[PDB]
RNA sequence: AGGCGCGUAGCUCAGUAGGGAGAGCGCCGGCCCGACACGCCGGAGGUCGGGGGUUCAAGUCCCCCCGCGCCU
């Protein structure tokens, strides 16, 4: 199976402590003959976000979305452009609550980090986020693989467009098990 | 084959272009031979938002409503990335407005002016130069799928619609557009 | 253009309120705007029986075939969108579980109630709200929806689940209450 | 050999016995595992499956023979008549069901219980309007899954069956699945 | 605008009564009716000649062939559902199980019984009851779909076999009751 | 390789005498045969119903369905020529009338005759020779051709009407009696 | 708006062109009248005109004849006939062949004894020519008749049996020859 | 998700090579008795739950569908 694993699996505490942790995982994900696919935008935003590299960019082919060839249902992108508006004036109220809290009392370094916090987890939890997850998405589309990660909208929208899922709870398991 | 939108009849500049309005569109969509689809959402939000009268029952006689069939069509997903890579960036930058908001507000003791502030920032961050609205993506589906015109005057829509690859108008002559195919 | 017809479009009060006055006046009324306009006016077979077994005009009937072309949707060379299925039983499900709830309700209060018939009709009424309304009810919606979908026509009916699985499927949909300005428009 | 599953497989008790739901799990994985076959169960069916019964530990090696993903309704379509046909049938039922709840409330009136009355028509009402038809979108999805695949449906549902039928689902007998695993691996 | 018609507009008892009085007469008026409509009035070539077979009027047969195109359908061209022949096999089943019934049943009372030509009477009247009765017997019946099938036209017909199976095969039907004053609102 | 299989396959006693003896071990060594063969057999799901209401073995239906696939011809998406039809109406006629002139012959034999108990037998010999010898005869007949016709199979049968109309459709045939022969080299 | 597409047969049998005024010339002077009055669309293929021009002969009158009936060749290749046509056609031809060979082998053994070939020759010119051309396309004029018929989707007009017999296996509108005559009267 | 059992006169139930539509208990006409009681007889007492097949013959055997329950 052309396992499209994405960053959500690879660095994470949970993904880390289920599956540093990327010897223990290869121990055995090059092994039981799981061609596992990982998107070349995935793997760069992840190099910017944390790091025998080189050795682990030797199991997971780094490959690029392929999007010129792939298509989206128009229910994919209304699912998403309705989602978008509630998430989007979410983020809105709670900046207008910020606000509000901001006029009478005045705690700049203990509302910013609130602020962030609520902004990042009513705006970017839930849906897809960033394109370096569409392009994992359209990565699983295409390759008829599976696409373990731990984004609560990735995989909502993984399984809203006909992709494979695994727990990735039990990636390490499914992954020695073979 | 025009696949029209809200803009193109709530906005006063479009509607003083050509009860008078919407008049002078139905008997040009009447006589112009040509076909005008408006989404269900769109024509409904429009609906919601105008109140013509008498002239609703005219403009189903010429404009068709109906849902773009989102079930058969497909849109590339070069649209899909660079609708998400917009939108991360938009969001990105509401969050560092609200935070500029929060700060500045420290400041200030007069909410109701910080307040609009900040909301005139998010509505034109985060719901300007990309779909906002579903009726929007409608449109676009509308269009892309019949392969029409997206008359309207959003720059986010006329964007999109160009990026997936549906051949965009102008309502400025949008009226001189329907005048000359008639 | 083509117009699919239904059995609303000549039962429901205000649909022949606004045609007309009186119901059978309605569908005359209809008949001469009908031949005129220049259009292409369907119903399916099963609505035209139903609608027929409901009210009787008489020798209108006669009149009425003419303009409207009533056949079966050819259901044979058609298809529907599987999602449109997936949503149908989603929404069934949910609309059978509060059918059952009210049921349930209704059975523990008529437990210690003294009059029944007022709690039967009670009943009733709630059971085709809660699972008649909103969906397909009946295979005639059905029809009337498939021979809009075949024909590329415009779907026209009162009834709210109808208009709205037919929008769902991407079938051209008027607002009945009008129909008849549509109508008069194009003659 | 592609195989779409459905919850009745592991969920009736009569399916487990001709294969306890925890070894069953492990024999079905066992006999599914050097198959050659591909069993694919849909993405809401295992969710609802999940929620019925809880297995410990063995869903991690469930995920990989069993492939979990949805129909991919987009690309798919169904028949025009299929549609008529469930509609009409579903309108009968409904219909059957109004009569049942007007039967129980009005024989409850002068009866005072209503501690077993009202399971008797709990019970009365799904058998009149789950059993035979298709009631759950997990029956859709598990239908559309083996309609994309041109699969064998596996399902103890009877509706299903007599559904997937309509459509030209290749239909299998839930009990001898096991024993056709058996021969299947021979 | 396209009228398919059959035998029975012309020789059932109740279709030419409507026109006029007795079949003679009742086809005249309805040529009358149906030169002057505008429509496309169509019969098959065998259930013309059947009927011609059954009513044999003198001249009004030259007058008719103007106005009703004689056409036997392009069978070559036509197609029909696979479900359509399915379920016309699965009901023809059971008729014919049921004429064997009567025929076991009209024997075991001929073996008692005295009038035995009556008895025989009786047992073809129940026969072409149970087995042609509400379904499609003759080729003729077959003529009729396919013509109305690929004209798109309208079926006009009182046997409920064609009704109920042009409506199955997606035929637009026509109450045969009502036809001639439909022919008298398209001529007005 | 796709093959339509039949229930005189398994059931005639000829073709289930060249596929070895006993009715049991028939299909058995069938199954064998078809196992190593990759050769795609299929079965309409009316005729093994037909078939396990005619026949019922036990435990051979376990491995039955492995080799051949049972699923309906999909008769939606199936068209059939109008000849077929008009052919097939016309020779049922013909049979429709002999049947009939057999039952008023048997009844006229019973009027003066005695023993009606064989002779309503003869008469059940006669009339489902007349009416269901040489065409198709049940709906079973009707989907093992669909299903032949639309996975372009071969159909084997020793059906002598179910051949006969097959050919009028261009469905590949066979001799039901060289199947077990094709099936022994097919490996 | 209709347009009949004629034969030979219509003006060379003796009882159709006796249905218009008598003798085989006459006949067309009243067919000219008729048709030219009744505003359709007559035709008749090339081939068919020639054999028409040999046969039968008048002076004079084909000046009037070309106007009205429209002699053209049916456009051949732009048209298709379905396989089983051809298919059926053949197989008809093989039994005719068949029939024709043994009528030949029974005339042979008829002079072997009886030395009167004088009839015989006749009787045997007769049984064959009965026995392969009579009831089936006999003549590429046939053919033409049937695809001038078919590309203008017209009426066939012909006394011929099996002309009118194969035209009614294509789909052809077909018309009684003996009242054709009648067929245009009251249409004009 | 399914499984089993039973629908037979007014009530409760037997009946099977597939060769009868019954028993007990009811109700009436008889009958000892003034007559009801008891006994003694008989008559009335059927969609064998419905439909479809097979048979010479079906409540019986096969298939499907309803109802009543018990169901784990």
Do not use: C
């Amino acid at each position: 199976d052309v396992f499209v694993l994405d960053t959500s699996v690879f660095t994470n505490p949970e993904i880390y402590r289920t599956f540093g942790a990327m010897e223990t995982f290869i121990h055995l994900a090059l092994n039981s003959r799981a061609e596992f696919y990982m998107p070349t935008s995935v793997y760069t935003e992840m190099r910017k976000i944390m790091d025998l590299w080189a050795e682990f960019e030797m199991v997971v082919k780094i490959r690029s979305p392929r999007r010129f060839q792939l298509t989206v249902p128009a229910d994919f992108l209304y699912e998403f452009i309705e989602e978008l508006r509630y998430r989007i004036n979410k983020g809105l109220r709670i900046a207008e609550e910020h606000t509000r809290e901001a006029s009478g009392s005045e705690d700049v370094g203990k509302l910013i980090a609130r602020l962030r916090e609520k902004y990042r987890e009513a705006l970017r939890q839930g849906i897809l986020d960033s394109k370096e997850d569409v392009d994992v998405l359209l990565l699983a589309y295409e390759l008829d693989g599976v696409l373990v990660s731990a984004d609560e909208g990735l995989r909502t929208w993984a399984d809203k467009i006909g992709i494979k899922l695994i727990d990735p709870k039990n990636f390490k398991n499914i992954l020695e098990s073979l």
